[PDB]
């Protein structure tokens, strides 16, 4: 934040300011499922149709 406003008495005051910092590292996730071709892909998509 910027310094609070001040009444004038003689001379200005320079004051100071600060800054912050935050760091984050990524992660990798997955999920896999196994299905045999004949089950539905060659016969019919009765299940896993909405896979």
């Amino acid at each position: 934040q910027f310094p609070k406003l001040r009444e004038w008495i003689g001379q200005r005051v320079i004051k100071d300011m600060a800054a912050q910092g935050y760091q984050i590292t990524n992660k990798l996730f997955e999920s896999t499922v196994g299905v045999k071709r004949t089950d539905i892909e060659d016969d019919n998509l009765g299940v896993y149709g909405p896979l």
């Binding site: 100071d16 300011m17 600060a18 800054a19 912050q20 910092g21 760091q23």
Partner: protein, 50 residues
């Protein structure tokens, strides 16, 4: 009073690639001492008469 991670180290720095592929390798010279012979199978056999 910014914290060091966001300083000249990382925040204020520009990446340059002037040093890339500048140190070369010794020039090829095998042609001056050797000759190239093509092949189209597992091996090659040479024969001369005498």
């Amino acid at each position: 009073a910014i914290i060091t991670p966001a300083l000249i180290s990382a925040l204020k720095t520009s990446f340059q690639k002037h040093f890339q592929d500048a140190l070369a390798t010794a020039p090829s010279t095998y042609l001056q001492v050797a000759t190239v012979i093509p092949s189209t199978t597992a091996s090659n056999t040479y024969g001369w008469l005498g």
